[PDB]
Design a protein around this ligand. Sequence first.
Ligand code: SF4
Ligand code: SF4
Ligand code: SF4
Ligand code: FES
Ligand code: FES
Ligand SMILES: [Ca+2]
Lengths: 148, 905, 156
Amino acid sequence: ATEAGLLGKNIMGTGFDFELFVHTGAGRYICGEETALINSLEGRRANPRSKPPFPATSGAWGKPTCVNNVETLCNVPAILANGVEWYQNISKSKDAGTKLMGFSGRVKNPGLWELPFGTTAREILEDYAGGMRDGLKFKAWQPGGAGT
Amino acid sequence: ATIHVDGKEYEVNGADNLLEACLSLGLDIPYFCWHPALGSVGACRQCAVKQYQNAEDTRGRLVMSCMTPASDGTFISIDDEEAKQFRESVVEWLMTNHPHDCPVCEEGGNCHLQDMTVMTGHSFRRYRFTKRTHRNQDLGPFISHEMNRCIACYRCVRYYKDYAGGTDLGVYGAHDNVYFGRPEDGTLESEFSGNLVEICPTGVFTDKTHSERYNRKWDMQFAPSICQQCSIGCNISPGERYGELRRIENRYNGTVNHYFLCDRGRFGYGYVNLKDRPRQPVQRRGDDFITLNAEQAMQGAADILRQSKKVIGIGSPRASVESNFALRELVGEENFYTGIAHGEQERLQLALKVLREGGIYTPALREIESYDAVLVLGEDVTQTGARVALAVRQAVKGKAREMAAAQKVADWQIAAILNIGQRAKHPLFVTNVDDTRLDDIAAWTYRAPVEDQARLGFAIAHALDNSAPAVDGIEPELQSKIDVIVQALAGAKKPLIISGTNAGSLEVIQAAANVAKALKGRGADVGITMIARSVNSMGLGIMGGGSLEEALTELETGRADAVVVLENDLHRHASATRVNAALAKAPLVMVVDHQRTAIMENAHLVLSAASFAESDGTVINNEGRAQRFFQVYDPAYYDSKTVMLESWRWLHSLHSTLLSREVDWTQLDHVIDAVVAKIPELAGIKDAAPDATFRIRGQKLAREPHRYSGRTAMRANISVHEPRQPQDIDTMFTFSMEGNNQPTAHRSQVPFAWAPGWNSPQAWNKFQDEVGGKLRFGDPGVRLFETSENGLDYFTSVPARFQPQDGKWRIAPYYHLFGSDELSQRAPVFQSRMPQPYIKLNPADAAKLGVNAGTRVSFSYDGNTVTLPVEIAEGLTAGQVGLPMGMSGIAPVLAGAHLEDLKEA
Amino acid sequence: AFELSAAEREAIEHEMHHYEDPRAASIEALKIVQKQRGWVPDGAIHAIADVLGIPASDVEGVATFYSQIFRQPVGRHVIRYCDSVVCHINGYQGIQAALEKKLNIKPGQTTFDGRFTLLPTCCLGNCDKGPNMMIDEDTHAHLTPEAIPELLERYK
Ligand code: SF4
Ligand code: SF4
Ligand code: SF4
Ligand code: FES
Ligand code: FES
Ligand SMILES: [Ca+2]
């Protein structure tokens, strides 16, 4: 993208300068917290910070800083390309857009599928994950990872 | 602001958080990680209270009172059941890994963690698993390390890094394996590391000097005193046991030295417990050394003083105001000589004239932390007035404080303040002969001789105001740095100029005065700060007298056949050979001192005076504040043959025996009233402390806690008949627990802090009107002089540029916090902390002389060919030799002198 | 007796170019030293502190805070097996038992020849293909206890 006129100086003739870096972490779970992410980006121990103040006003190095997930920034170009009204008309649910959902752990086909919001967890388990494996019964499930 | 605590309406300050607002009102909330000086971080989660937004609300929300602002319309509950159970659970979680160490802990009975475990009411252990352990590090001679007792409250690292500016203490480790200390073993080289023993709520960092001879806090006999190791005059609480000075605790003075001392004033007290100190009057008869009591000493001394034609008196800046005045009134106005040299006295009187005649307000030490742009001229503050350097660090971080305050961020949110103010800080410009310890935060550091520092000061004064005298011959790069300094100082709202008499030059003080005058002429809130050398240098300068050289030549020509030396070694302010010859030629030398100095071999009579731990008196600090220090213990209670009295008592009884042939032991208030009657400029020392007739509802002030133990057994080896407690006729204190030490008593002199439920140094919260603010009913000590209506004129004596003369070497002073004091270096614990005597040399000068680093060269000054090993100093200017002032054989009077015959030997 | 090589020094300086604070390159400086030498020795903390200008206490705190910055000497190859919840469902215990049977060590130690160092690690983000194991730069999925001896011979 940098060589093909999309990152660096004077992007697409507008006059906007933007530099993109990849900061590879050093293996700590708490670094995913946004203020601990900011602390780790400043070369410090990844202790989180109290809010207020939020990172939007004083974040990385005291500057305005917005921290967003990968999937949010992957949702944004579809919004800016195919429009806003198309994005609100994906599913008839209060949560607009599509979420990467999926079941894992001793199921027939564990994986990751892009589904609209409002799809029940049973449709993910039987239609997509295929249900439980051979000779195995269902006891419990966790919706959003280890912290749910 | 108006808050509601447990249904009761309270009026609080809305810029404070809920914890300090509630602690100011007397409400007890448990807390660990919050400190009044450091700020709020929300770590320990101990300060939980239940907050409601409406008056009609049942559920509420558990919040941290240290992280919650005390806004108007908040309804908090402290003793709600949910909040109490959560605080008890936090104490329990801290108690899961805490070792069973309270009997073998130096912090036992002084422990914040013990107090907060008792306050939450947790006394039953349901945790049955293992406790984590930690190895310990060697942190030097002062601080003992015991990492198992840590509760991970992060007070130590926050103080040591974000406040003291230290670089070798930090947090290491992980989830529950957090370690607090150094990356390796070694001495904590911060000059304020001694405050860790009071910052830490647990027994991790402890006083090793106190741990050598350890007693508990209830066994300590305390007194309010003033630290005598330099001129700043920090209020201390010396505490003794069994006749020896055990510990020096911090005494809260919200005006001077609120929560923090320096390491010299906290660990340099070991000279009091030396066994070579004089304990009786000793008279020399030929080779025999006979011992007298007080009456025979007075009668014999008065007989020889009457049998002499003229008696002169050499005071000292180490002595108190009353003792120097008693010497002056014993020998006369014209026969009294200050013990300092002529150049030291000239610099001291110039500094005093600038302070009380320059028209520029000299700030208190707490007020130093509010000035914007700081210019230090000549002074090595961190080695001579270190606490001023700490306040300078606070004033430097004031820029980040104001930048965060511009973004509606609260004052107590210290982490957000440091986040917003990343590296932007207030301008600091230090000048010295070499690199200082303020260079990490200094906007610029000028390494030059004192003549060039004075010339840079005069150039700054000329560029700020063109009426100031100009200095010609400044390089364009130096001119650019000067105009950078001028643009930083002129744009400041409260500029501060710090100089002192330790630089060894008069023109440095003149240049600082001219800079302050130029800043005042532009309409700026300029403050000036002179750093003196000794504890009562300013009082000796105000009282005045002749120099040491005048007394020496008076003894040498024979006009003085009797010399009385008051607490002076006389080798610190003059050459040892001349002093020895003068005192050997005089037929009567009478030395009133409490430390075994070198001139006692020639002394015909030695009076065993009392040190600050055994005497009452007044000392004038560097800003002109008269402060009263009180006696800690009676030396003769345990050791019955000890005849050790106050020096002013010695000299007053000596003058009474001289006049009326009667021995008269006076009272402290009588000598105080004599000073106010005779010296109108020392009139403020009467109001420094109330007299001995002061009572709190009829009772005196207790020197020891109410649980002082061993009363009927601490003297039972001498005799089973317990004697009467010693009577204090001098002060309002008593040498017993039968007295008053309430937090709500109407007094300003607090010997120690204790409250029911608060045994730690956090008990100072109960003794203040607001926590971290002023002391209740005012701080002790009053200012001697006010700011004058008019100021001085510009000093036009601009010095010439330093040209390195061949053969002669200019002595550049190198002051050390451990080593440059007269009495602190006599402490045995300072031997392992004092640096080795190294003469500092330029690489070019050492290459010219053929010397490399490590080898020994010899130099001769006044017939003393002494040899020192060479340390290479890159920042030192060529033509100078760096010498350590105050070391063995190198007097501070050697600063600015010449040095001939510098050869490798 | 420690001294930063040339290439490490220009790598640290080039990473200091990326941020407006030299402190922010501390994690990558430690990772560069670890990539060069296998781990971060004692003198590396002070050398990185000198090359960044920050105190050595902060460098030590960063090095001891992060689990993948090794402050103790490791073997030639670092085996890192996931012990999180999904691989616990998928049976990481058999994989760990096979690794203990092969290497004859406990998790956290290094073999006597210094070939493999065995370490538990958190979730590798490959839970649909569990159990997983991270050897030095390679992730291995769909693990079986009989595939451990055939899989440990490609790292000499
Ligand atoms: S730090 Fe306090 S609670 Fe811990 S062992 Fe020492 S006295 Fe007891
Ligand atoms: S060592 Fe003391 S001050 Fe530091 S975190 Fe532990 S308990 Fe707090
Ligand atoms: S700064 Fe001076 S007066 Fe204060 S504690 Fe240190 S030596 Fe004592
Ligand atoms: S005092 Fe509030 S969380 Fe520590
Ligand atoms: S739980 Fe093991 S890879 Fe995620
Ligand atoms: Ca007394």
